[PDB]
Amino acid sequence: VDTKEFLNHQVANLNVFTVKIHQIHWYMRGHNFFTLHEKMDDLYSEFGEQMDEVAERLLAIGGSPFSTLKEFLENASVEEAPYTKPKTMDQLMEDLVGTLELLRDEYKQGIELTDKEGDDVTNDMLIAFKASIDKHIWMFKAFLGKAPLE
Amino acid sequence: VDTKEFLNHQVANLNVFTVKIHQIHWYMRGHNFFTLHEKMDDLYSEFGEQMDEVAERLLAIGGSPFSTLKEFLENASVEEAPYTKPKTMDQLMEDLVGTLELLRDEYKQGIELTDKEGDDVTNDMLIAFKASIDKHIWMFKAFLGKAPLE
Amino acid sequence: VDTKEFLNHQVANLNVFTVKIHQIHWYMRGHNFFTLHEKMDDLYSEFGEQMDEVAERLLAIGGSPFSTLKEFLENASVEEAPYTKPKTMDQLMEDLVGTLELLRDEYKQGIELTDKEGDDVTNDMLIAFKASIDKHIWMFKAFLGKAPLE
Amino acid sequence: VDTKEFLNHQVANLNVFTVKIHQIHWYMRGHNFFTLHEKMDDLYSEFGEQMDEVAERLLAIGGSPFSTLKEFLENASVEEAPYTKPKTMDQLMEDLVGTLELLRDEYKQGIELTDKEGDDVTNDMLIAFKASIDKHIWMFKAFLGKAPLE
Amino acid sequence: VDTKEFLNHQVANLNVFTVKIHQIHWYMRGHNFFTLHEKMDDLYSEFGEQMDEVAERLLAIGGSPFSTLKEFLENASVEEAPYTKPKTMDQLMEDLVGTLELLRDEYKQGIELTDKEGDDVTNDMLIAFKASIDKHIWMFKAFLGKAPLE
Amino acid sequence: VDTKEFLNHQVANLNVFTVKIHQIHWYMRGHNFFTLHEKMDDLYSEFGEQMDEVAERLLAIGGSPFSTLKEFLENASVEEAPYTKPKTMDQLMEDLVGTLELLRDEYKQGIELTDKEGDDVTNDMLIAFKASIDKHIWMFKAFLGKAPLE
Amino acid sequence: VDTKEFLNHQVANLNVFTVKIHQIHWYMRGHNFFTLHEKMDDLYSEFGEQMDEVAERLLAIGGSPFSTLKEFLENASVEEAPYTKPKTMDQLMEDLVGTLELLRDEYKQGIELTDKEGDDVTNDMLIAFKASIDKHIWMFKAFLGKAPLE
Amino acid sequence: VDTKEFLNHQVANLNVFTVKIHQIHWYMRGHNFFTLHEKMDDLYSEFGEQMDEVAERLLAIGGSPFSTLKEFLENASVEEAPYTKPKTMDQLMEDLVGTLELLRDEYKQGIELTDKEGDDVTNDMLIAFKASIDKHIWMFKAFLGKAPLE
Amino acid sequence: VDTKEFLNHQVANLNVFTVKIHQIHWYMRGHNFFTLHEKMDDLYSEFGEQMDEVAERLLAIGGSPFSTLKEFLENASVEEAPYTKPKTMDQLMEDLVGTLELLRDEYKQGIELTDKEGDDVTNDMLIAFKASIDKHIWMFKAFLGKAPLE
Amino acid sequence: DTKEFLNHQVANLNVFTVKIHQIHWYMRGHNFFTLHEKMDDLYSEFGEQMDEVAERLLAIGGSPFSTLKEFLENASVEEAPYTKPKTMDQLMEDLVGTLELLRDEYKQGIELTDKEGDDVTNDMLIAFKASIDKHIWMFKAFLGKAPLE
Amino acid sequence: VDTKEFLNHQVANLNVFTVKIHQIHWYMRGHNFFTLHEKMDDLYSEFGEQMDEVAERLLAIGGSPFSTLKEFLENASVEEAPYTKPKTMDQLMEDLVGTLELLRDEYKQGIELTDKEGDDVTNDMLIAFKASIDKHIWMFKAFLGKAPLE
Amino acid sequence: DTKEFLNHQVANLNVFTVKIHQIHWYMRGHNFFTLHEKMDDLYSEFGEQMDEVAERLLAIGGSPFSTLKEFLENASVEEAPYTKPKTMDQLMEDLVGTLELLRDEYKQGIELTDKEGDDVTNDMLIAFKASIDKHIWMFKAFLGKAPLE
Structure with a gap:
């Protein structure tokens, strides 16, 4: 696995993630609603910017970013589930934290990889x-x- | 179709559409690159906000928005295609205009529908x-x- | 009932309501105090502006807005109660949601009425x-x- | 009259109206000069914007807006007169109020017209x-x- | 009388007063309409904030602010009258100046009182x-x- | 021609010119549409400001500015034609540049004239x-x- | 009379003038109070800036600006009178207009003078x-x- | 105690207090984390400013403020304890409220003291x-x- | 002396003082020129605002502020001297510090005076x-x- | 070493910003407005790169080139007088070329400073x-x- | 020493350092007072931000930041002395520069350490x-x- | 004529802004912070003078110098490498000198353009x-x- 495949994989991951952040943002209920709702707006913007920057970096190194929902689903290691059963605020935040940990470890692999490749x-x-x-x-x-x- | 189903269909449409806007944003080439590149950023923000407002309206009327790429793919009438063969600026803009016209006509149907349902x-x-x-x-x-x- | 009487009624309702928002703003206690305290400031501004625009619209159509606390009490359907027994954050929020629902339903009635009179x-x-x-x-x-x- | 002709007519009207606003802005005298002078600046911008938006709407529905002073004079129903004999602040403000009422009623007809044509x-x-x-x-x-x- | 009762009394007074400012704001006519209309918006904001700070200070010293129109009418010494006969700009301004003088003198009394109690x-x-x-x-x-x- | 008449003539010129800028703004098509569309917005604001400043200067030296479309048409040397046959972006820009050269030369005569008169x-x-x-x-x-x- | 003496004379003039603007600002009464009071604030700032710029220009050409009230009184051609009798708004504005005309004509002499001197x-x-x-x-x-x- | 000693004592107090605020900011856990975390940022700035202003006041009256952590610990009456065992949000907020009450009462003594010394x-x-x-x-x-x- | 006379004396003082600040601002030379030059602009604004607020207070309590350079010269205890012999930066700053100390001590007397008069x-x-x-x-x-x- | 490299890039960046102005002044064509403003943006950005590089060179005990003569004598970026405007595509080709030169030279500087522990x-x-x-x-x-x- | 302990040690260093910056800020005298006074304000904000960021980073890697003055004194290698004997501006600046060189060298060791540990x-x-x-x-x-x- | 003068001032102003940076980088002394920021301000201001002069030269049909070589060959402003920082008073003397040179040359340009009707x-x-x-x-x-x- 090389730098381009990793960045493209993260494009897919980050798109699935921003959709997930929207899911939490829309379906959350409980006493922390206002704070965590606005906070999800902040996260949505932040990782949308991460996604744009990863795609622009991929472009700058001669790669071709995934640019369809089809490609994002087919390539992302982040997981998503339709919202059927009502979840508590803690359950949504645990889903978010889990995805953040996945993205952290995968980014660690990308840091080591890009170090070896000299990028x-x-x-x-x-x-x-x-x-x-x-x-x-x-x-x-x-x-x-x-x-x-x- | 009723109002809730229509709004949800538009949530799917707008997610597919914003990703398409990103595709044009990343892959465009030609003498108009800088202007249309910024223009695509603007459209991405604007229709991102449209999608936010549609989802929030669907929530306010007691509906449940689609919140996964799987659901968006399953429900959107907006068409996406992976960027394989290179396209000219006019061709990418014709794809954009086509999807804008689709959203226009579907929005006209939704306007008549909601006016008929009294929403x-x-x-x-x-x-x-x-x-x-x-x-x-x-x-x-x-x-x-x-x-x-x- | 006609348009003028409806708007004036909403002048009374919105004055009783903003004072209620002040009651919740002042007397609230609990873990969500900071967020809901700021939120109540926001609601006070928002419905203060709604009240200003309802009165200005009433003036613009040749009406005469109620302009005293006496008239507001005499004509408003929003109910107010002095703060004697302590209320929880959830009790205050239920009161708020109740008044918001009252205003929603009455505003629905005004939309239908004004659509009937051609305003x-x-x-x-x-x-x-x-x-x-x-x-x-x-x-x-x-x-x-x-x-x-x- | 149809929607396109109405919108074009209002383009002519708004050009005659903004020029009139400039006339009052320039020729007013009296104790309220500073307030009403700035106020005329505000109206000039506001109705300049109405004109721009009316024209852009006319373009969006496939019409062709008037774009010369000749067409504005030939098509506007708003009436203008050169400033000759000195006029009081109340006289100029009466001219403004009259033109505002003309635009109000014509806009009423346009609202009914577009409502009939389904626009x-x-x-x-x-x-x-x-x-x-x-x-x-x-x-x-x-x-x-x-x-x-x- | 002590500090708490004084601040609460001023809560009632300031609510009656801001509503009065709205009455003047809505019903004023004459050559100074634009300037005095904006000025009344400013006064409404300013004394709205005075009222918020008086209530917050009352809370901070262990008091309980009046929080209904009924209590405001029952305790306020600022007098309100429904707008039945037309009033001139000078009549409205004289009413305003009168209430400002009432508030000045009562505030003088509160300054002396609070200086006496060591607040x-x-x-x-x-x-x-x-x-x-x-x-x-x-x-x-x-x-x-x-x-x-x- | 003296200073007052020169400035008034330029009031007419600038009014016909800004309307022309609006014409170019509305009817332009082609690959440069977005940039030149906004650019025409800017030019319209700038030359509207020049016109207002010219009229205010004319007022300050004891002049009386033209303030009707009729006066503008009768006195302006700037040329306008209704948009009938389609024109290319270069043709509209050549019309604009031409009018700019006209204004440059007429302003050159105004500079020489005003230097002559000691203004x-x-x-x-x-x-x-x-x-x-x-x-x-x-x-x-x-x-x-x-x-x-x- | 040379450039330095003229600029220093205008330093004295402008100081006397800004004090006069304060006089009008403080003592004015009448229905235009709010507008003309704020306007005097604007004028005070504007001519204070003129004064600073004249003094800095005098310094830049090797001159030494007056820098005491004594020098300002001793050298200014602008006149001032203590406010004893109440004046109407029109009387104050006529005093202001008179001083403005004095400053205009004296500046005209300075423009001609600096032209001859090549400054x-x-x-x-x-x-x-x-x-x-x-x-x-x-x-x-x-x-x-x-x-x-x- | 005199004014200088009191002010210096409050400098020590405020340094211990701001560090405590940072402690709560860092170690808090629970559902109100985001709101109270930002709130601690706000308090840290506010009481940092109180400290700066108290020290500058002490300088202005000829005193010499403490300017080392050693002097702060040796002179502060505010009490600090390292964060060891986990504490609930209510426990940390109780510590904050207690320190705020300490500062309140000590400030009461300082107000009486400066009132006695005529400062x-x-x-x-x-x-x-x-x-x-x-x-x-x-x-x-x-x-x-x-x-x-x- | 009473409060009105004291405030008027300070109006005179502050006019003499702001002109002195301008003198230091214009005539200063030395290595600290840029910093102290801007600092003098700041002081000019600040004490200009002090003078504005003193005059407005004198107006609000029924007094009549001095409003000519003649009155300021006749009533100020702040000393001014024409800039003849060149002064060092330390010397100009010592003049500034001297006048600041004068204003401080007079302000202390005014604080005691107004506290005695109950203002x-x-x-x-x-x-x-x-x-x-x-x-x-x-x-x-x-x-x-x-x-x-x- | 690091000081030699940074000073070289001071010269390069001064030649480069002057070239950006050159494109800014001499460009013609339908893309004039967009690329004209764009050249303002690039001039600001690389003006800041140049200031920041010089400040770093000073911070490590170096002495930056500070005259046009030193810039010409030391810069590897190339400049040519325009008589002459050239097409928009030609100016953009020149810009892209200098950008690639600066990219590769910066890569060498990254490796150099990595080896030197800076x-x-x-x-x-x-x-x-x-x-x-x-x-x-x-x-x-x-x-x-x-x-x- | 590992990464957690290094960051915590720097928390202590930065706290002692910002207090030192406050010392220099308060006790400095001389011709450069104003510029360096504001400059110390800036440094205090910047190094306060560095400290907060270091503590947040320490928290993110599972650390527990020092959060009392006692811990800061016991663990910081930055040196502080109470301000007793007067010091020149160059002496205070030499103390500051010295502490900056200490922080530079300790940060160099932290960079090498964190590179070693893969952080x-x-x-x-x-x-x-x-x-x-x-x-x-x-x-x-x-x-x-x-x-x-x- | 006017074109020759404006182009000369393009060269002068480029040499001048580079000199302003030179002062900005090499200054030392107790006034460092104030005059350092001040040099940022001057660099912005005369950078804008230089852009505006070039835009005027283009507007009257001229072709601005746009290379360091042309600037050196045409500028009457003088630059010297600093080995070497010099005192703050020395740098300020150099700056004041260039400012006076630009003042007098600009005066000649005012008279020239006045005679030429520009x-x-x-x-x-x-x-x-x-x-x-x-x-x-x-x-x-x-x-x-x-x-x-």
Whole structure:
């Protein structure tokens, strides 16, 4: 697996993720609704920007980003489920935290990979994104009454 | 079809549409690249906001929006295709104009539908969206050297 | 009943309502105090502006808005009660949602009435207000762990 | 008359009207000069925008807007007279109020017309403009010490 | 009388007063309509904020603010009258100046009282409010062609 | 021709010119549509401001500005034609550049005239406007692939 | 008389003038109070800036600006009188207009003088200031129901 | 104690207090994490500013503020404890409320002290700070479901 | 002396003081020119606003402010001298510090006076001004290498 | 070493910004307005790169070139007088070429500073290269070409 | 020493350092007082932000930041001394520059350590902070007339 | 003529902005922060003068110099490499000197364009000179000197 395949894989991942953030944003209920609803708006913007930047980096290294929902589903390792049963706020936030941890570890693989391949720019980009992702994992786990690595 | 089903269909449509806008945004080449590149960012934001407002309206009337790429693919009438053969700027803009016209005509059907069901709010929302889509159809058709309805 | 009497009635209702928003704003306690306190400031501004526009529209059609607390009490259908026994955040929010539902249904009546008398402008105004009120009913009921319209 | 002809007619009307607004802006005298001078600047921008939006709407439905002073004079029903003998602030404001009432009633006819032809977007646009015109008529008639419908 | 009762009394007074400002804002006519209309918006905001700070200060000292129109009418010393006969701009402004003078003198009483009970914070708050009210009395009486305190 | 009549003549010119800018704005088609569409918006604001400043200067020197479309048509040397046969983007831009060169030359005569009459203020004003016009001629001729003085 | 003496004379003049503007600002009474009071704030700032720029220009040409009230009184041709008798709004505005006309004519002498002396920078500065002064003379005379040169 | 010693003591207190605010900011967990996390950012800035202003006031009256952590620990009466065992949101907020009450009462003593020594400026400064502290105590006690003085 | 006479004396003082600030602003030379030049602009604005607020307070309590340079010269205790012999930056700053100390001590006398006359508003106003002056005395004395009270 | 490289890039970046102005002044064609404003943007961005590089060189104890003579004597970027405007595609080709030169030279600087343990200068150059790569994609797309083409 | 302990040690360092910046801010005297006073304000904000970011990073990797002055004193290697004997501006700046060089070198060890442990995020963060610190050392040493590495 | 003058000032202004950067990078002393930011301000202002002059030259049918070589060959402003930082007073003396040179040359351009009937270029140069005179007063005051001294 090389840099282009990793960035394209993350394009698929991030599209599935922003749709998931919309799902939480729309279906959440409970006493933390206002704060976590606005917060999901913030996350949607942030990872939409991550997605645009990953696609633009892929383009800049001569790659071709996935650009259809078909390709995003076919290639993403992030998972999604239709919202049938009502979920508690904690359950939605655990789904979010799980996806954030997936994206963190996959980005770690991308950082190591781009280091071996000598792609310093992509490396730096992935590191910055991971920094934000770690911050979120800490904050949302704090919401869940848990330690970041718990 | 009723109002809830129509709005949900438009949620699917707009997700497919915004990803299509991203496709044009990433893969376009030619002398108009900078202008239409920024223009695609603007359209992405605008129809992202349309989708947000449609989903929020569907929520406010007791509906349940589609919230996965699987559901969007299963329900959208907007057509997507992976970017394989290279396309000219005029060709990408013709795809954009085509989907805008589809959304226009479906929005007209939704306006008549909601006006028949007595949902005044959704009616007004759809009319505002159509106002904007008609403007975009005029402008992009002008870019293509054509009259709006031609 | 005609358009003028309806708008004036809503002047009375909206004054009683903004004062109610102040009651909730001042007397609320519980873990969501900070978020819901700011939220009540927002609602006070929003419905203060709704009240200003209803009065200005009433003036523009040749009407005379109620302009004293006495007239407001005499004509408003929104009910107010002095704050004697402590209420929980959920009790205050249920009162708020109740008044929002009252305003939604009465605004629906005004939309139908103004559409019957051929007052297009007042109709459009009430429809925009109802759009926002429906949004609020969804969000606050979501705060209460309930579906909108439930 | 149909929708296209009506919109074009209002383009001519709005050009004659904005020029009249400039006339009052330039020639007014009296103790309310500073307030009403700035106010005329505001109206000039607002009705310049109405004109731009009416023309863009006309373009979007396949029409061809008038685009010369000759066509405006030949087609406008708004009436203009060169400033000759000095006029009082109340006289100029009466001219403005009269033209505003002309535009109000003609917009009423257009709202009915677009409602008959099923042009929902143009109907909504004209309704918004009429809301603003009604507000202005109330305020300027108040300036003249008169009721909005007096 | 003590500090809590005074602040609550001013809650009632300021609610009756802001509604009065709305009455003047809506019903005014004459050559100064535009300037005094905007000015009334400013006063409504300013004394709305004074009312919010008086209530928040009352809460902060362990008091319970009046929070209904009924309590406001029952306890406020500011007098309100329904708008039946037309009033001139000068009559409305004289009513406004009168209520400002009432508030000035009562605030003077509260400054002396709170200085007597050792409530430094409430004293400082009332003194700032009186500073502004005195400024308003000067300016509006100047509008009336009169000296302040005359 | 003296200074007052020169400024009034330019009031007419600038009114016919801004309407022409609107014509180009509305009827343009082709690949440069978006950039030149916004650019025409900018030019309309700028030359509207020049016109307002010219009229205010005419007022300040004891003049009486033209304030009707009839006066503008009778006195303007700028040429207008209703948009009948379709024109290319280069043709509309060549019309615009032509009118700009007309305004440049007439302003040159106004600068010489005002220097002759000792009108330092109007001289300075016309020089500033001419600076702007010269820049516009350079940029639009560069757009047309032409030298500024070509 | 040379450039330095003229600029220093205008430093004295402008200081006396800004104090006069404060006088009008403080002592004015009448129905135009709010507009003309704020307007005097605007004028105070504008001519304070003229004064700073004249002094900085004098410094830049090797001169030494007056910098005491003593020097301002001893050198200014603008006149001032203590406010003893109450004046009407029109009387204050006539005093202002008179001072503006004095400053206009003296600036005209400075423009001619700096032209003969070849001081283009000071010339341009004085011309810009005069442009504003003419605009004010027109506007304030319009307030007085008079033509600018009347 | 005199004014200088009191102000220096409050410098030490405010440094210990801001560090405590950071402690709560970092270690909080629970469903209100996002709101109270931002809230702690706000308090950290506000009380950082109180500290800066207290120190600058101390400098202005000829005192010498503590300027090392050692002096802060040796002189502060605010008490700090390292975060060891996990604490609930209510436990941390109780610590904050307690420290706020300590600062409130000590500020009361300082207001009396500066009032005795005739230090009007420091008296006023401490009164403003106490107003803010009283507001915070009301709000945070409301968060804990308690009355401000309970 | 009473409150009105004191405030009027301070109007005279502050006019002389702001002109002195302008003198330092124009004539200063040395390595600190840029910093102290901007600093003088800031002080000019600040004490200009002090003078505005003092005059407005004098108006609000029924007084009549001095409004000519003649009256300011006749009544101010602040000393001005024409700039003849060149002065160093330290010397100009010592003049500034001297006048700031004069205003401080006179403001202390006014604070005691107004507190004795029971004018709480003017008392608070003067205390705020003294707070700022004490800060400035600290900073400029620090610039001069001195302790505040030295 | 690192100092020699950064100073070289000061010269390169001064020649480059002057060239950006050259394109800004001499461009003609239907894309004039968009690319004219675009050249303003590029001039700001690489003006800032140049300032930031010089500040880094100073921060590590170096002395930046600060005269046009030193820039000409040291820069590897190439400039040519325009008599003459050239087509828009020609100017964009020149710009893309200089961008690729700066990209590759910056890559050499990243490797150099990595070997020398200058983490800060390494990070700075990586950030600049990220932007330069984006520009190469966009201007190459303008020219109807793939990025690495 | 590992990454968690390194970051915590830097939390202590940055707290002692910001308090030191406050010391310099408060006690500085001399001709450069104003510029360096504001500059110390800026440094305090910047290094406060570095400290907050370091603690948030420590939290994100499963660490527990020091959160008391006692922990800061016991763990910080940055040196502080109470301000007793007066110091010159160059002495305070030399203390500041010294602490900056300490932080630069300790951050260099943290960069090497984090590179060793594979902590790409913390590595990148420390590099950004070190970039800023290197710039500050250059600028402050230039202020002291010294070379950066001198 | 006017075109020759404006193009000469393009060269002058490019040499000047590079010199402003030179002062910005090499200054040391107690006034470092104020004059460092001040040099940022001057670089922006004369950068804009340079752009505006070039745009005027284009607007009158000229072709601006657009390479460092042309700037060196045509500019009357003088530059010297700094090895070497120099005192703050020395850098400010150099700056004031270039400002006076630009002032006098701009005066010649005002007279020239006045004789040639180019009112626009005349007004532009007069505005620039106004600013340059203000700067000469302020920097001369910084040096403890009278403006025309």
